[PDB]
Amino acid sequence: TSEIILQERNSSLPRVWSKKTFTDATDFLGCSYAVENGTSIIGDFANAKYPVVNMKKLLERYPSYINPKELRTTETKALSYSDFDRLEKNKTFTKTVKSGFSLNLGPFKFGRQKTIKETFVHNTDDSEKVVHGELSIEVVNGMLNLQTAPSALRKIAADYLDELFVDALYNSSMVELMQSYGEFVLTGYYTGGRASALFYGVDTNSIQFDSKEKDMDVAINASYEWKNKKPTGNLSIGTKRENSETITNKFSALSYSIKTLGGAYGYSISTPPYDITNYSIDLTPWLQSLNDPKTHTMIDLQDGGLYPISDFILEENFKQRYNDTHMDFQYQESLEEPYIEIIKMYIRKSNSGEKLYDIVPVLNTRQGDKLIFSNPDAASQSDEELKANSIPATFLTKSNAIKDEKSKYYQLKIKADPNKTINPIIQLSFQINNVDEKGMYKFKNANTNIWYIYNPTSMYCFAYYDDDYIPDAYGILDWVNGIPIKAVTMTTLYQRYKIYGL
Ligand SMILES: [Cl-]
């Protein structure tokens, strides 16, 4: 509203903010994993999407980053849940994600409900009577782990990312990247075969969450048979005769659908829904197909076997955006026009209680991050100086002076606005102190084709994949071409610099 342009985006610059560019069980490691848009079966190989880590390249240099271990066990787990928050009553999915990460369960819960609704015939059912069930039957044969020491993860980020993942990182929005890849990277899983069954019951007489869950607990447990459960037997789902009374005594209807993971002679595609007392399926051939380990696949996740994508990238702003987007704090559908806004940054309250501000250029990136170019010596200044930034006349002079300077390096829209505040001291924005376009060097990483432009006095760095369309979006191609080439090692860069992706 009181926004005023100080420089139109140079009109000869283009307006382009983006470009739209499993043999065996061990190949899932370092791939993205889809929660929201997957099958909702935890650890299901189908939810493995695309490679994030270039594993072949990594293992060619450091073979010890991978660590397989033979297992020979069987596992059954049953879960009953009256609603989609109760889905996580045993933290089944929660504990698969890296300990300490801020996990948003919404998408997982949404995906399960979406699947339930697609798997089971459309209903008039009174949700009060509804309870859900899940069964897992697993022949476990192996275990795969990627090294996850932070220093390992940084090395991977720097040099061992899949080039199409690097593409998505710089040529689409984080939103788009998560739609295509999913939200997590596979670091720890189990291999073998698995039968997975979902149940949908209408409890005849209980509406209490716990009572219905105990009813489902009993039903699930009366509804399958594993005789002689040897690892490394007969298996069937469905009740008959005596066991059917166990079900009908508590449920007016209980239906199920199964899906087998790996093996042969099973059910690769989720089955239509069947009444538990009417239709039984013999999985015996499928179970004994699992004696051929060639038929094995990814079947479940290790605790902490899923790492956020943010652990696999160096860029501060992408890391934060991934996190914020996952948490539903931010959502930019697609990359946009960058611009510098000269606005006010909160510093402190005067001894009269008055808010005092510095005037600051803030680069808005394609991704919509705000990179505040702060003056850390602004806090030293005396109250009356800072208060003079509230005078329209000093704002004119300073804003125009900053524009005159930054204009030498950036040909994008520069605007000023005396009524816009940005507060990084109390709060997405980032602070980069002592930004100075004159003090920079650059080098290209040969493995990844990323340019890293770094200021070795102030310890900040702007990164971008090597396609001129990007510097052109910021109208900085001239400037960057003039920047002298000076290599620094990746480890020095990420250990000693803050890196921001343009
Ligand atoms: Cl049926």
Numbering used by the authors: 36 to 56, 66 to 276, 287 to 481, 484 to 558
What does the literature reporting this entry say, word for word?
Membrane-attack complex/perforin (MACPF) proteins are transmembrane pore-forming proteins that are important in both human immunity and the virulence of pathogens. The crystal structure of a bacterial MACPF-domain-containing protein BT_3439 (Bth-MACPF) from B. thetaiotaomicron, a predominant member of the mammalian intestinal microbiota, has been determined. Bth-MACPF contains a membrane-attack complex/perforin (MACPF) domain and two novel C-terminal domains that resemble ribonuclease H and interleukin 8, respectively. The entire protein adopts a flat crescent shape, characteristic of other MACPF proteins, that may be important for oligomerization.
The data were indexed in the orthorhombic space group P212121 and the structure was determined at 2.46 Å resolution with two molecules per asymmetric unit using the MAD method. The final model of Bth-MACPF contains residues A/B36–558, 239 waters and other solvent molecules that were present in the crystallization or cryoprotection reagents, including one MPD [(4S)-2-methyl-2,4-pentanediol] molecule, one chloride ion and three ethylene glycol molecules. Furthermore, Bth-MACPF is likely to be a monomer in solution, as supported by crystal-packing analysis and analytical size-exclusion chromatography (data not shown). The MACPF domain contains two four-stranded β-sheets (A and B) in the central core, which is decorated by several helical insertions. Insertions between β1–β2 and β3–β4 (TMH1 and TMH2, respectively) correspond to the so-called TMH regions of CDCs, which unfold and form transmembrane β-hairpins. TMH1 (residues 126–173) contains one helix (αB) and two short 310-­helices that pack against the inner surface of the B sheet. TMH2 (residues 248–304) contains an antiparallel αβ–βα structure that sits on the outer surface of the B sheet. In contrast, D2 and D3 of Bth-MACPF, which are distant from the TMH regions, seem more likely to play a role in protein–protein interaction (e.g. polymerization or interaction with BT_3442) rather than membrane attachment. The shape of Bth-MACPF appears to be self-complementary, which could facilitate ring-like self-assembly to form pores across membranes. A model with 16 copies of Bth-MACPF forms a doughnut-shaped molecule with an inner radius of 110 Å, similar in pore size to the the C9 MACPF model.
